[PDB]
Subunit: 333 residues, 4 copies
C-alpha cells in the first residue's frame, strides 16, 4: 500500500478518503484537522450531498477505524509538526486551503512526507496537473505538485480538443458554481475582504473571480493567455457547469464537428452526454468533466463564428476523482 | 384620467402589475380574472414571499375585493371572450395568464369589449413587441394587441442598443442566469410542455433552458436582428436574474471603462447603472428594466482580437412589471 | 411474477418502480400518466434527490424498456378506461393523488385489475396499512387497500411502542416536512384553496394540516383519538422528521428506558440510531421510520412529558413501506 | 442624542443600526468589528433578507457617513481597548456573541461606556429583559443588561397570557428556526463541537438546543421551571415559528377563548393575526412575537386537555426591534 495522509479533512479531504477506499493499493493511514475524532468520524459517515459512507466507521483514540483499518488522526495546525516520519507517509493530500504554495507546503516534507499533492491551484515552481490532460508532465522527481482547481479540471480537456481540432484564438468563460465553504452562511464580514463571498451563500447569485481560464496555460501551454472569465456562485450545494465562448481558427466549424470531436476524446476523466440533464445529475460523478452535447451552439454573422460549449462537473467528486488519479500516477512513476 | 385596466391572470406578473398600478396616478385596475376565489386572490396580493407585504388595506367582498376602499371586481372565467369587458368599459387588459400569447388568441378580450390588450410575454402574430425606453416610440396608438416582450429581453435590449450604437455589434452570445419561475415543477415530475429540464425540482438544480430574448432581439432593435443567440440557466433563487453578454464589436480598441461610461451615459428610469458589488437579492423589487453592473465588465484580447463581456441584473418579476406598466401608461396616452 | 401497474408515475410511482426492480417476483408491466414515453423514461432515469437509475432505460412506442424488459405506457386520465383486463394486472399502485377513495379507486377493478393499493390515505371502507404495524389485518380478500401516509408510517411504530411499553395517555405531534408537489413553486392561486400551500415551497416555513396523528386509530385502534398534530413544510426537497410529545401512563420513565424500548422494537421497517444525523442523511433510506435516540427528552415538574423524534424520507421510506405491503397483499 | 455604540456589526448589530435610524434621539456614534470600513458600509447598504438600506452610505476614514452623519468605525477584538471614554458612549449594544457574560461585558464599562446591553442571553447577575413583558424590572441603575434571545422574545408574551388567563401547569416548545451564522455553510468541523451545527445550514432540518423555554423563569418568575423544549433549524434565511404545547389549570378552555385572550394582550411588541401567513410574511416585522390564531389547537381525551399555540417571529428584526425598545427604555431611566 501507498501510504497517504490527508491534511484537511474537509469536503475534498473526506471525499478523497471515500474515493481512496475504492482504489486498491491506495491507503489513508493518517488524517489531520482541527477538531476531535468523533467529529471527523461523523462527517466521513454522513454527507449531505454525497450520501452515507457504506463502510463501518468507529471512533478509537489514535483516531478512527474504517472496516477494521485504523486511521490515525491529528490536530496540528502547523504541518511541519506532524509526525510524518513516524508513520512513513508517501503522499500528503494537502486539502486545508492554507498551504497553497510550494514553500508553505514543503512543511509536510520537513515533517517526513515524501511528496505533497495540493488540492487546489498553488503559487511557486510547481507543476499544476489535470489528470488525462497533462499528468504525463510528471516525471517522478516532483516533491510538491498542484492538482489544479475543479473549474480547470472541467475546462482543460474541452479547451484542449477545441485547440487541437479547430485552433483556439480566444475565449471567455462563465462557470455557474455550487456555493462552497469559503462563502458565508449569512451576510457577514468576509475574512479575505471579498464583499460578494461575504453574502448569504444559499440565497444569492454571487459573481466571483476564478483563475481557471486565465491560468489555463499552466496545464496547456499552447493556449496560454487565450482565455479569461469568471464564476457565478448559486444556491446548489454541489454540481457546477462551465460555459465557454470561443473564437476558433477554422471558420466552417459545426455543431457536429465539435460534439464528435468531444465524443472521440472522451475517457475516464472526460465524459460525453447528449441527455438533457441538470446539476443534480452530476453529483457524485467521477468524470473530471462531462461534455454536454445538448448545449453546443454556433453563432455566425457574415463569415465570423462564435462557438459555445458547456461541460458539467461535480466540483466536489469530479475534482476529487481527478485528484486521486493524479495521486495514484504520482505514487507510481 | 382613470384609464380602466383589467388584469387577466392574477399571477406573479398580474399581482405585481396591480401593486405597481397603485403607485401610478390615473391608472386604475377595475377588474381581475383568474381561476380561484376572491379570498385566495386577496390573500396573494396582501402577502408576497419575495416582494413583501402589500402596504394597502385589502378586504374581501363578493363582487371581488376592496383595496383602500376601491372595489375591484373579480372573475373566474377561463375563456376570455366570455369576460364582461363591455359592461365594465375596459380600456386595456394586461394579459398575464401565459395562455393568450398570440395576437389572434388575445383578440378574445377585444371581442369581450376591451379596447386594447397588452400581453405580459413574447407573442406570435403581427404584433409590436415593446421594451419601454428602447422602442416604445414604435407605438402609434392604433394598436389593438401589443406584446411587452420578456423579462430577459427587457434586461438585454438597452445594453445591446448601447453596444451597437457606440461600438457596432458584430455578434454575441448570451447566457441569462435566472430565478426559477412557476412553469417549473416543485419536484421532478412530468412536465406539461414535455420539457425534460423544466420537469426537474426548480429549487434544487442548475437547469439549462431556452430563451428567445437574444435570437428575437431584432423584434425590438431591428438593426441587430440575427446578431445574438443564447440560453438560460435557471437556478434556485426565487427571483432576481442576471444577463451575461459576450460580444464581438466593430471597434477593437475598446476598454472596460469606455464600455462602462457608455452605459452610465445611457442610463434612465428603465436602465440603471451601478458600480457596487451587488448580488441577486439586491435587485429584488427594483423598478429598472435592467441594471448594468460596471463591476462585471471584461475585455479579452489576443493579438488583434477582442471579445467583450458585460452583465446586467434584473428582477425578472418587478423589473419586468415596471417596464410593462410604463408601456401600459404610454399605450393609454 | 406478480403483475403490477402504476397509475401516476410521479415521485411515489417512479420510486415504487425503482423499488420493484430490487424486489424479485414483483413486476411492473404498465404505467399510466399524462405525458409521453420520453418524459416518463427520462424521469425514471434522472432523479434530483434519489440519484441516477442504475439500469438501462430506452424509449420504445408501446412505452419504454428497462434492462430489456418492456413496460407499456398509457395516457388515460380516466382509470376505468385502462386496458387492465388485456394486460392481466394483479395490482395497481394508485399514485396519482386523484383516486384517494375506495369507490373512485374501484375504477381500476372495473378496468380489469384484481386489486388496488392506494399510495395515500383514502376515504371509504378500506383498510389503512402501515407495514409491520398492522399489515396482518390484511386477509387477502381485500379489493382496495390504502398504504396510509408517509407521516403515519413514520409515527405508527413509535406510538405503538410508547403505548405497549408505557401506556399512551395523550400526545401532540409536529412533523417537520420536506416540501412536496402539491405546493407551488412560486406564490400562486392554489387549486385546493390552501393559502399556505399557495406559497413558494422552497422559500418558507409553511404550516399545514395532517391526519397522521388524528387518524392514527385507523392503524392502531387502541390509541384512537389519543393523538393530534400538524406539519411544518420547510425547504428541503426530501427527508422529514416527526416529533412526538406525549403523556405516558407510567411516570418514572427515563431517556434510556425509552431508547431501549425503541431499539428492541427495531426491524426492517423501523430503524434505530444513536448518531446525531440531519435530514440529508435519511434521503433514500428504506426504513419506514428511523428512531433517533439522540433527540429523546423527558421533562418533569413535581411528579412527566416525554418527547421523541423519528426521521423518514417521505419519499423512499414511504415507498418501501408501500412495496412491502404490495408484496404482502400479493402473497395471500 | 443618546450616544450608542455597536460592538459587532453583524446581523443584529447592523439591523439595530438600521432600527436606530428610525428612532429619534437614538444615535449610533461608533461601530466595532473585525473588518474594514468598506465592508461595514457595504453590508449596511445591502442585506439579503431585509433589503436595501434607504439612506445614503458613504465610506470615509474615521469610518462611514450615513445621511451626512459620521459614524466612527473600529477594529478592536478586545473591548476594553475601545475608546468609549473619548466618544462618551452612553450605551453599547454588545452584538458580537463573544461577551455574553456580565463580567466579560464589563470590558466596555472599563473602556468608558456607561451601560452595556447584550443582544443575547448572558450569564452573571444580570437582568434578562423582554420588552413589554418585564422591562419594568429595570430601575436605571443597571450597568449590564441582557436583551434575552429571539425565541424568548417570541415566547414570553404568549406564555405570560397563558399563565395569567388560564394558569400554566407545564409545557413543551418546539421552535422551527431560520438557520443562523453559527451554522456552517457546508458540512465541516464546528468550533463549539456541535455535530449538528457542523452541517450545511441550508440543506437540512437540524435539531438544536435552546434555553428559551427552560430559562423562561428569568423573564417570568411565576412560571420558572414549567417549560422545556428545543429547536429545529431549517433552510429559510430568516423568519421563525415558536410552537407551544401546554397543560393549563383551567380545563374547559376553547380555541376561541385562547385567541381572544391573545388578541386582548396585543401591543407594539406582541401582534395578533388571523391570516394564514407563512414565514416570509414576517421578514422585517417589528413585533417581538406575532400570535397566529389560525394555528390554535385544543386536544382533549375524557376530561384532559392539551393546548397548542404558535407565534411567528423574525429572529432578526423582531428581536432587534425588541432590543432597541429596551435600549430606549434603559436610556430613559438614569
Ligand atoms: N469544495 C470544492 O468545490 C473544492 C473544489 C476544488 C478544490 N477545492 C480546494 O480544496 C481545498 C479545501 O477546500 P474545501 O471545500 O474542502 O474546504 P473545507 O473548508 O475543508 C478544509 C478543512 O481543512 C481544515 N483545516 C483548515 N486549516 C487547517 C490546518 N492548518 N491544519 C489542518 N486542517 C486545517 C478545516 O478544519 C476543514 O476541515 C481548498 O483549497 C479549495 O479551494 C475545493
Ligand atoms: N419572471 C416572471 O415571473 C415573468 C417575467 C416576464 C413575463 N412573464 C410572463 O407572464 C405570464 C404569467 O407568468 P407568471 O410568472 O405570472 O405565472 P403565474 O402562474 O404566477 O400566473 C398565471 C396566472 O393566471 C392564471 N390563469 C391561468 N390560466 C387562466 C385562464 N385561462 N384565465 C384566467 N386566469 C388564468 C393562473 O391561475 C395564474 O394565477 C407568462 O406568460 C410569463 O411568461 C413572467
Ligand atoms: N412525500 C411524498 O411525495 C408522499 C409520500 C407518501 C404518499 N404520497 C401520496 O402519493 C400520491 C402522489 O404524490 P407524489 O408526490 O408522487 O405526486 P406527483 O405529483 O409527483 O405524482 C403524481 C403523478 O400522477 C400524474 N397524474 C395526475 N393525474 C393523473 C390522472 N388523472 N391519470 C394518470 N396520471 C395522473 C401526474 O402527472 C404526476 O406524475 C398522492 O396521493 C400523495 O399525497 C406522497
Ligand atoms: N441571528 C439571530 O437570529 C439572533 C437573534 C437574536 C440574538 N442573536 C445574538 O446576537 C449575537 C450576534 O448574532 P449575529 O447573528 O448577529 O452573528 P454575526 O456573526 O452575524 O455578527 C457578529 C459580528 O461580530 C463581529 N465580531 C466577532 N468578534 C468580535 C470582536 N470581539 N470584536 C468586534 N467585533 C467582533 C463579527 O465580525 C460579526 O460581524 C449573538 O450573541 C447571537 O446569539 C442572534
Amino acid at each position: 500500500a501507498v501510504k497517504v495522509a490527508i491534511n484537511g479533512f474537509g469536503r475534498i479531504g473526506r471525499l478523497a478518503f471515500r474515493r481512496i477506499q475504492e482504489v486498491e493499493g491506495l491507503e489513508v493511514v493518517a488524517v489531520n484537522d482541527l477538531t476531535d475524532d468523533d467529529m471527523l468520524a461523523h462527517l466521513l459517515k454522513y454527507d449531505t450531498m454525497q450520501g452515507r459512507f457504506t463502510g463501518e466507521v468507529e471512533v478509537v483514540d489514535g483516531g478512527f477505524r474504517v472496516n477494521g483499518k485504523e486511521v490515525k488522526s491529528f490536530s496540528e495546525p502547523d504541518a511541519s509538526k506532524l509526525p510524518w516520519k513516524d508513520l512513513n507517509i508517501d503522499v500528503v493530500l494537502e486539502c486545508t486551503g492554507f498551504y497553497t504554495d510550494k514553500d508553505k507546503a514543503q512543511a509536510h516534507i520537513e515533517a517526513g512526507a515524501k511528496k505533497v499533492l495540493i488540492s487546489a491551484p498553488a503559487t511557486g515552481d510547481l507543476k499544476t496537473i489535470v489528470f488525462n490532460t497533462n499528468h504525463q508532465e510528471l516525471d517522478g522527481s516532483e516533491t510538491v505538485v498542484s492538482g489544479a482547481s475543479s473549474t480547470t479540471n472541467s475546462l482543460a480537456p474541452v479547451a484542449k480538443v477545441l485547440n487541437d481540432d479547430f485552433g483556439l484564438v480566444e475565449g471567455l468563460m462563465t462557470t455557474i458554481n455550487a456555493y462552497t465553504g469559503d462563502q458565508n452562511t449569512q451576510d457577514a464580514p468576509h475574512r479575505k475582504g471579498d464583499k460578494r463571498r461575504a453574502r448569504a451563500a444559499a440565497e444569492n447569485i454571487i459573481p466571483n473571480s476564478t483563475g481557471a481560464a486565465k491560468a489555463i496555460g499552466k496545464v496547456i501551454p499552447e493556449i496560454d493567455g487565450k482565455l479569461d472569465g469568471g464564476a457565478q456562485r448559486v444556491p446548489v450545494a454541489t454540481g457546477s457547469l462551465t460555459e465557454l465562448t470561443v473564437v476558433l481558427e477554422k471558420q466552417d466549424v459545426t455543431v457536429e464537428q465539435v460534439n464528435e470531436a468531444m465524443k472521440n476524446a472522451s475517457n475516464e476523466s472526460f465524459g460525453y452526454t447528449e441527455d438533457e440533464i441538470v446539476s443534480s445529475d452530476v453529483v457524485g460523478m467521477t468524470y473530471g468533466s462531462l461534455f454536454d452535447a445538448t448545449q453546443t451552439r454556433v453563432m455566425s454573422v457574415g463569415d465570423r463564428q462564435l462557438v459555445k460549449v458547456a461541460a458539467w462537473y461535480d466540483n466536489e467528486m469530479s475534482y476529487t476523482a481527478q485528484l486521486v488519479r493524479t495521486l495514484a500516477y504520482l505514487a507510481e512513476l
